[PDB]
Design a protein around this nucleic acid. Structure first.
Lengths: 103, 150, 56, 110, 117, 142
RNA sequence: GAACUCGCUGUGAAGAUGCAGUGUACCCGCGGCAAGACGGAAA
RNA sequence: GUGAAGAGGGAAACAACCCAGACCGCCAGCUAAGGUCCCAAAGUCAUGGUUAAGUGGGAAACGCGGAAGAUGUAACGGGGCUAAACCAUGCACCGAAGCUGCGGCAGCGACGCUUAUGCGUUGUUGGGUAGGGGAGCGUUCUGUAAGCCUGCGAAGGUGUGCUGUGAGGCAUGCUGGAGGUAUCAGAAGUGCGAAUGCUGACAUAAGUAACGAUAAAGCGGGUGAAAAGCCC
RNA sequence: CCCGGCGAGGGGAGUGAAAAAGAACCUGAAACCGUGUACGUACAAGCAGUGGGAGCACGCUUAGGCGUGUGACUGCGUACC
């Protein structure tokens, strides 16, 4: 049983129990937010969509940890024109857990 | 550089670098191009800026509670136990004693104590007021510092 | 006729692969003294094909 | 308890010794002198003295059981080079380089 | 005052040689080739991040059309079927659903054919 | 979640017998080379060879169209003295009909070890009988 | 300078070991042949 | 107008041709030129005609001809196509760093919190040579400093981990075994990738040439661990 | 004390806190040459990288597909001043 939803602009196919990656939100670490936006309900006979956002489906997402991702360097070089520069970036991330899908 | 003007190798004949002298700055044991000369590093200070800075730092030592004025500070004999025992009676270790004219008993025992330094009224310096913690005036030296700065 | 690049360790190591050796594996045992030697050669103590020789 | 036998500054090149030293790697000590004794190179004469040194340290400085030792650690390193000159045609100063050797062979019963 | 450069040059090259690990010899050991090796590797690592969303989009279009031909529909009719069928599902979920559940994607093709015309 | 990458050892491929008798050469050969790629399966991976097994029987009786019996003349060089090897189509059918198929299918595959690895799975024959009937093949109606 | 250094069509600071396509080629040596090399030299 | 001083996609490849101005990341979506038979991502898509020659896939004046291209097919990129070419219409799709949403940083405008100015925020900008401007990292010495750490282990060397958009910093494994130095300021012989730069070491050709006039050596015995060269 | 040539160079004992302080003697990086171990390559073509990624080896959670090395194959990519 999986669920399809869109939180950080990109969609995700996430089952229950799995800790999955999402973008950085303004959510406390002791908060468990609910996503009423769902695009597929997975059963033996699935519930598909003609129009999106099924009312009967809800997703329970809890947040355990905030932080920054892997250090990725960016090198901009131009040959024989006297130009180089180097900079880094560490992207924020959220690890959430999904428990329970209301079919 | 002690050396010669002789070329280490000629211009033609070899496949080496360009050579005009052995005392090139990009070679070993050569002469420094931008080498320094003996030069004085002192620079002019205005008098009103100097005495105004003394007014600025003595306007601050009176506020930071670093300024202690006593009745009569002198020593009986040139004896460092009598000097350090007297400073032990008022618990002062790192101070600057500023006083009146030169004392034969006090100035003779000043060098063996590093943290304790004594001077005269005409030889005061701004660097002696920062590196030292508290400054001890004498009752007679109150009139001398007022006519000193003025 | 002169090289314009530096040969690497892989070219040198793949070039030196044919310079190795192998064991002789020709040691025979003399029946008289019980010591080893080479086939068609003589021993140190002076014995050859079981027959005693000069041995000075 | 291991046996260390090493040789410094041999009269040989750094390359030719390694043609000999790769042959006796992993072999039994008792059959290794049987190989190095009848080996026809000059470098086999030195490493025979190095190996017979290690057997003698396995007799005098070790307890017993000389026969069950196995050659495990063997490697040949180069040392300093001796710098002299050599005359040629057209009067230029040719330098020459003389190789030295460091043969460190460690043998043990296990 | 004379200052030496031996403490900043090698410590400066520690950061370069710790990023020059594993580059076939002279790009790993020799600093002159390793410098342009790290620089040019920065160029390919910079460009291929912008080619990752090209190649994964090519794989998604390949796998949607690759699983749509078993039901007898083309790719362009299936994207128009989902778009006129008000389906907001992107290509990653369509590429992932073909691995696990086949009759789910077959139901997506049949639902696309339902609201096709 | 990462995109699913299939193991090359667990690629469930099957046998497919396709009779090329009476078909267009390039139009069928494009489909056959396209199914040697593995694109017709849902689990396609561009670095995992998921192409099935394709058996082509009786390639000598293929349906040529237009004037292509005379038009196509194949040329190849061997790596020698500069004389070129010419071959008319009516003689290539007469001496080795499989090689014509190997030119088209080999031409429609990408250059590399993977493309020739997909060329290994092409089995084109001239006769109706073969020895792949033991592995329970499934004839493809096309 | 680094090389894990093949041949054809065209491109090209203008005859490509490196570019787009195609074709050949187990890996590595040895001895010669000097056609390719900005190697001396022959307008 | 572009390149000079512009990245990306198509024209097989191709600075100046066409689209299109890259703050960064994202396994999100929508588009321009160009395409939807494979290579190579998407229509073997619908309708009306031409083509018989691979014209397409190199050519004028002229009555499908005029028509000759090069190591190798080699004058579509290649296979190969009677539409998978050519003319027109319609509907979708592929298609860039273009556009939108999400996540983050910096600057310049106008406010509102209200005042040593930080912002609940607001739209906007951020390709770049020559050149100008602002804000920062590290090293030597000095006042701070007869202060701090330290033989329960200093500098240096050598790896991992954390963090900062950066030059860096932090603690720790091992070697080492005696000095280093917080913060605030000043003084530079201050940061290397090249100048056929200089001094030392080390590969490279490679164990390749060569081992020195073409008067030539052979054998026994003695010492020595070992003798073609030396002792007889 | 032993081997080694009544050599050179070491092994063992001992001094020394330490002989990774042995007279080539403080600390000993790199270019260069080696030896042990995990992986890959002997049907494969191009500034040798980068994105994806199969298997193998080792510590972890007392599995929860964690981390490092190796990079079969594949898209793209013609050194620096």
């Amino acid at each position: 049983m999986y669920a399809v939803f869109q939180s950080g602009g990109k969609q995700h196919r996430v089952s229950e129990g799995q800790t999955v990656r999402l973008e950085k939100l303004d959510i406390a670490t002791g908060e468990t937010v609910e996503f009423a936006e769902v695009l597929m309900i997975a059963n033996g006979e699935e519930v598909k969509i003609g129009v999106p956002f099924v009312d009967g489906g809800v997703i329970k997402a809890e947040v355990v940890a905030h932080g920054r991702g892997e250090k990725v360097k960016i090198v901009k070089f131009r040959r024989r024109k006297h130009y180089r520069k180097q900079q880094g970036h560490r992207q924020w991330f959220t690890d959430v857990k999904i428990t329970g899908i209301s079919a | 550089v002690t050396g010669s003007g002789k070329k280490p190798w000629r211009q033609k004949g070899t496949g080496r670098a360009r050579s005009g002298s052995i005392k090139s700055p990009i070679w070993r044991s050569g002469g420094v191009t931008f080498a320094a000369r003996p030069q004085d590093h002192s620079q002019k200070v205005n008098k009103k800026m100097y005495r105004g800075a003394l007014k600025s730092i003595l306007s601050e030592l009176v506020r930071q509670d670093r300024l202690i004025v006593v009745e009569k500070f002198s020593v009986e004999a040139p004896k460092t136990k009598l000097l350090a025992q007297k400073l032990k009676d008022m618990a002062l270790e790192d101070v600057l004693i500023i006083t009146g004219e030169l004392d034969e008993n006090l100035f003779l025992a000043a060098r063996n104590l590093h943290k304790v330094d004594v001077r005269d009224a005409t030889g005061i310096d701004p660097v002696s007021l920062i590196a030292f913690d508290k400054v001890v005036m004498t009752a007679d030296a109150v009139k001398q510092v007022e006519e000193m700065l003025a | 006729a002169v090289q314009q690049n530096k040969p690497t360790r892989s070219k040198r190591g793949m070039r030196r692969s044919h310079d190795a050796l192998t064991a002789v594996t020709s040691l025979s045992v003399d029946k008289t003294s019980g010591e080893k030697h080479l086939r068609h050669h003589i021993t140190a103590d002076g014995y050859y094909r079981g027959r005693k020789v000069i041995a000075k | 308890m291991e046996t260390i036998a090493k040789h410094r500054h041999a009269r040989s090149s750094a390359q030719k010794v390694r043609l000999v030293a790769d042959l006796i790697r992993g072999k039994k000590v008792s059959q290794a002198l049987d190989i190095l004794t009848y080996t026809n190179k000059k470098a086999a004469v030195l490493v025979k003295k190095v190996l017979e040194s290690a057997i003698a340290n396995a007799e005098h400085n070790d307890g017993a059981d000389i026969d069950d030792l196995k050659v495990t650690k063997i490697f040949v390193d180069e040392g300093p080079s001796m710098k002299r000159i050599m005359p040629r045609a057209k009067g230029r100063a040719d330098r020459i380089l003389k190789r030295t050797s460091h043969i460190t062979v460690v043998v043990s019963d296990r | 005052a004379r200052v030496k450069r031996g403490v900043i040059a090698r410590a400066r090259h520690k950061k370069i040689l710790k990023q020059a690990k594993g580059y076939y010899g002279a790009r790993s050991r020799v600093y002159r080739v390793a410098f342009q090796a790290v620089i040019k590797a920065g160029q390919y690592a910079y460009r291929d991040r912008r080619q990752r969303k090209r190649q994964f989009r090519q794989l998604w279009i390949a796998r949607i059309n690759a699983a749509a031909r078993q039901n007898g529909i083309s790719y362009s009719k299936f994207i128009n079927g989902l778009k006129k069928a008000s389906v907001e599902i992107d290509r990653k979920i369509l590429a992932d659903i073909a691995v696990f559940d086949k009759v789910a994607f077959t139901a997506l093709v049949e639902k696309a054919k339902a609201a096709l015309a | 979640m990462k995109t699913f990458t299939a193991k090359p050892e667990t690629v469930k491929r099957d046998w497919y017998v396709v009779d090329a008798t009476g078909k267009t050469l390039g139009r069928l050969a494009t489909e056959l080379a396209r199914r040697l790629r593995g694109k017709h399966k849902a689990e396609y991976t561009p670095h995992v060879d998921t192409g099935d097994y394709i058996i082509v029987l009786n390639a000598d009786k293929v349906a040529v169209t237009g004037n292509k019996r005379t038009d196509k003349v194949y040329y190849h060089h061997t790596g020698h003295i500069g004389g070129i090897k010419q071959a008319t189509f009516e003689e290539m059918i007469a001496r080795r009909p499989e090689r014509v198929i190997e030119i088209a299918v080999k031409g429609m595959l990408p250059k590399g070890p993977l493309g020739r690895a997909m060329f290994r799975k092409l089995k084109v024959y001239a006769g109706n009988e073969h020895n792949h009937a033991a592995q329970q093949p499934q004839v493809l109606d096309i």
